[PDB]
Subunit: 83 residues, 2 copies
């Protein structure tokens, strides 16, 4: 139960990291666009901040132009692929 909760959270964060790597942008560029530090974005992408607001993930979905439900589904699929 809690393992899946933590694991899915990590995969959602890593899905956002993949969204950035897919489009070839550095952390510093996306961070500037979002008015956050590069370190803040990096700690989100790598799953180190456990209590990030849903709002932040919705902002990032809007920034990348990907539906948040698709981010979540992608994370679930990748979590299963790695299993």
């Amino acid at each position: 139960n809690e393992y899946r909760i933590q694991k899915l959270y990590r995969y959602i964060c890593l899905e956002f990291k993949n969204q950035r790597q897919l489009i070839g942008k550095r952390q510093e560029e996306v961070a500037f666009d979002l008015s956050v530090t590069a370190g803040h974005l990096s700690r989100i992408e790598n799953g180190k901040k456990p209590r990030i607001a849903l709002h932040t993930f919705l902002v990032m979905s809007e920034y990348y132009g990907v539906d948040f439900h698709k981010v979540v589904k992608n994370a679930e699929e990748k979590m299963e692929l790695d299993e």
Copy 2:
């Protein structure tokens, strides 16, 4: 950045949890006890009144209700598009 859509979608996600609770017939007081929060706290979450709730909280509630969070979010997006066209 579409701040209007970001904020509305957040509230549609929260209200989707109110809908998920109602579909299975549990009262607020029961869920508040199981999730170790006050009934008032749960009510403010379900009604979209607290804007900075952690994603973790929604993952916990999805597991509690036995509903996949991606379906919760998809339901919210679709209902917002139907109601508001965005």
